[PDB]
Amino acid sequence: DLIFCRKQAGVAIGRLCEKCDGKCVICDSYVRPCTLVRICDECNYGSYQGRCVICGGPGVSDAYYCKECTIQEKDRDGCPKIVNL
Amino acid sequence: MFLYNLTLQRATGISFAIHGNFSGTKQQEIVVSRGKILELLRPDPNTGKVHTLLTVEVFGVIRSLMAFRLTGGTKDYIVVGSDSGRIVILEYQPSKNMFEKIHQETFGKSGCRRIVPGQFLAVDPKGRAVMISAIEKQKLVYILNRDAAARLTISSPLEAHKANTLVYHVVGVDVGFENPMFACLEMDYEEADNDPTGEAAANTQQTLTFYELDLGLNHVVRKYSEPLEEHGNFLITVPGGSDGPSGVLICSENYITYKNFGDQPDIRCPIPRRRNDLDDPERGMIFVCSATHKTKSMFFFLAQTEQGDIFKITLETDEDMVTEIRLKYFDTVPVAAAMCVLKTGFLFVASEFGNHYLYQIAHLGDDDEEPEFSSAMPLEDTFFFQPRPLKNLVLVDELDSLSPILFCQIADLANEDTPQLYVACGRGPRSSLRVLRHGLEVSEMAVSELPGNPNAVWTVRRHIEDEFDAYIIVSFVNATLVLSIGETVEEVTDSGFLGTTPTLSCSLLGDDALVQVYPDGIRHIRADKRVNEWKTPGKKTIVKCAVNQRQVVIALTGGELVYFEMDPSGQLNEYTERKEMSADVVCMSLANVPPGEQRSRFLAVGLVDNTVRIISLDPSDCLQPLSMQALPAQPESLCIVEMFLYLNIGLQNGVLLRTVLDPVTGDLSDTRTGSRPVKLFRVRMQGQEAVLAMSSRSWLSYSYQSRFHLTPLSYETLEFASGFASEQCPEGIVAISTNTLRILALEKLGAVFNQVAFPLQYTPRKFVIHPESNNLIIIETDHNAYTEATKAQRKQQMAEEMVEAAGELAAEMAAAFLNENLPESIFGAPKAGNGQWASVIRVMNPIQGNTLDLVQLEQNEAAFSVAVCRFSNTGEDWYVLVGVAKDLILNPRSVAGGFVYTYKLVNNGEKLEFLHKTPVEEVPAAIAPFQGRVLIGVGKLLRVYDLGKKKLLRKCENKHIANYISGIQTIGHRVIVSDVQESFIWVRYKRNENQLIIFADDTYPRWVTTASLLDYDTVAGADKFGNICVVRLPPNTNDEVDGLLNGASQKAEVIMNYHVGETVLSLQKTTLIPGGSESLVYTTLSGGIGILVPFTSHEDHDFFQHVEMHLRSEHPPLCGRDHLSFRSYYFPVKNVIDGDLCEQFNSMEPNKQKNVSEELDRTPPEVSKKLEDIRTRYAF
Amino acid sequence: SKYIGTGHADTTKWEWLVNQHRDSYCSYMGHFDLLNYFAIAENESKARVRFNLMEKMLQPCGPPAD
């Protein structure tokens, strides 16, 4: 049930927690963070305002795509928030 | 092989154009889009000139361009939608002269895609919402707001997707501060994909859909949708709110409709037609562009048809309802892609091809007798009008544009030493052959040759607030003559100089105090008739001086440095110290003392010593040596100048030096550009300083906002010159030649080529050069075209049929219809028919423009190939071969046959005489001389042909080429074939076996447009999609042959791949400058010219690679594109460095220039010099 | 599957070919110098070529089978 949200991303910036701080959301790499992550409006609302996009804990820093995912334009899909059903 | 790309002349074709107050002031500017270049223009309301302010390469494909303004603001923004998945908003900064990116919003993947938005862009007329749309289901809406600091904020997008839907056009609707509305022309194709009968494809209508954005609820909803009568092209926003109703104008085939939601009925008006039209009666009529002009009292529209007819559309209204649409014929101009109506009464026309125009709207209102059509008028049958020459408009300016370039040849067809560029460009009756030369064009100002020995001429005015000069003083060897401008310039007496001996310095000393220096001394002259004279002690005689309106230094025999000064009293006081050195001066120069300071300090001194010495002259440390630097040769003159301070060093040869003004030299640049001494003279270009260097050829040296240019001029040698000013022309030059006294002018705002044009009849396809006479043999061909004879007989037919209209047979419009033919270069050619062609063969002299011979072909014959050659079985006679198609249909493709014509080219290459005509079963698309015979590509077939007495004799044939032969090129042993869809086939001709054998091919499909041989093994190719590639045979390649991929056994390797962004149609290896290196020059369909040059060392390649790497990150493309991804559009880049990205280093800000330069272990001036070196090595 | 133009093991020749015809026409509308080439080749205004391509967008390759 690890599925990405894949909704139209807005102006909200994705956040990472203390455990996931250096990670890439899509491929889980740690090398060369390149592009700032954007999330949709339903992922950024109320109690969901600041939360890790990978796990859902309290965010502390910005989420980034890696250079490898940026080269393949994998930052052009929807909201990359991990959502469980 | 590693290549460096440089642009020599940018594209000049316009795709979109918007107007607005982009600088925030009250003047209006236009932003035009080239394919990949953004450009800001400003037309002068005083003279009507259009000046270019800024031009930026965006490294993408611009697809939509809008302007918008927030409520209460005075500045317009720019919204750009491109082939990236981003929408960008830009702001022009007048004080920095650059485009500042305000916002970037990413929504999808890059490229020109079906369902990713970026093709359509609409904006709310009040500026609170913007809609970006694709051709398919996806649409997005952004809300635009403003914070308390008056900066622009953007929201997250709202989706309005709708599957199985096609969009023709989107516009925002003007409401009165109500919820924003957007109108769309839409079509649903779901039913058409499920019906195998094909009846759901027909019976399918366009809808006009309205989308309402509810700012209170924050969502987009479909409110209204209505089916239309027929399919329409673009929409027009009608101004609403408190000035006008709020609807849309739908432009359609033969009609224009007004529509609004509510209780408003639909109003239709048919488009008028030209009386006695010569075009095919089955064809309809559409509008191609529009322009709105809103005034605080009324509004109207300007729409143009495909024939180039502009009509003026007004709207007859009620309190809220519209009742009539009225159309009135306005004028005829070339077919435009965009039209902008400017306040202060100017109309800007950007044509689809050829030159662009700016018109003055001379006649406001409409007080005329010509009829006005209406929607209320009843007609069973259509309206008719008569096209006439311009009545409402006056032509004020014309901007040159090389788009579209179709064929090019670089060659020295005149007997200069520099080659010229012969360019067949243009389409239809506006085509032409243009000759391009590197230089500036000297405008003739005045000529009166007087006998004597002219040496020098100044242009000094009587006052300092004077814009009118006082005198011009040309010195003989025995005397001089000094004149004034009484608009009838001749001898003058009350000047006060009256020099019996020559005059070597004439300066404006005071406000109206003049310094006259001559070999026997100096006589300072007042405003009143008074002279104070200091003459020579004994036999020492001055030759050189250095003047300035506050201080005057002189040079007697022996380097005796004598400095004067004129203090606020207004008279002479000489300094105490006279420093003398070993030799006599040959050069010095005093910088123009600025109004900010009191006097000039630096004085470069060039002597027989061959050393520049820098000396101070302020009362603190005046006249004592500071720094000396030897010379490479004998100097003639130097000059401290600006446009920050530099000096220039002229040698006695045709070579130059440069050194930036400082206590120590900081920059160095030498250009081998003569064998004759350089003369450095003062002039003023662009209203600021510039130096006119002179040699066997005369050059102008001028930086331009850090754009250094050493450009020659289109005239031969001179010997002295300076600025000029008069009621006749307040800004010019006074130049002297052998047995001549000239005044000249230069009025071209920073161009690289000057061009002359010669008109043609149809679209030129290809031309060849006669080797003996240097004449050009051109073929011109057009589709949907009549020949001359068919036009004449069709017109006679229409006359005889309109005279028998069965009606008093008493008044003849037919004799008036037959007399004068409206010019096709102004009113267009009658485009009539679908399989109709028109072709012509022309012999032209390239020096003049005269047509030597003209052969017209039959109606439906279309020429595609031409060649000039000699046959071995004949003598030294020349022949011209023309390949012609017969009854060609393009879609679906069908042809009846082909012919090859043969002519004898007699009378010293001036006349063609028909010999015979050989039939072939397909279009002969390529003809190439080959070993005393000729090769012809007949569709899929490659044939050898020898000359016969009654026709051409087939000798050999290969039948294994894939699809269609589009080009043939031969190097002595081998043949290179271009396929329409496959790239390249290598063939060998077996001379003794009489065989054509394929021995190599490629592994990629390429849509080849042109090809160029680089050496015995390598070929340079171009593509329809905008790519250039280089293909080389491996060294293993065996030539002596008697498939592995369903192809040939041996393959060729691709060693170069580059995306240019525009379609290349010409490639040629040549040397552009005398004494330079060979480069690969290409030509583009948008009017651009560029080169690819090889690197010779690994160090230069590595340095430029690192520059490109670092500039890719810290200076990204403006519209959101990835630079490496753009040059890898269809294939990945291979061994090319983008020098158009690299030269953007000179236009960054100093902080980022330092951050970039300190990584390359270098300073910005060194990087700039290294960038200029490789450019001046090959190109200009 | 949600992207228009993708296929699967049951895709027919007709669907494949109409998909590539449709995105070919969109690519022609997008790229500025391809439309120039076509408008010079067939001697028409660029607005007319654009409108013709949009009209051809509806049913390229004819109506489907059976």
Ligand SMILES: [Zn+2]
């Ligand atoms: Zn990643």
Ligand SMILES: [Zn+2]
């Ligand atoms: Zn986490």
Ligand SMILES: [Zn+2]
């Ligand atoms: Zn989400």
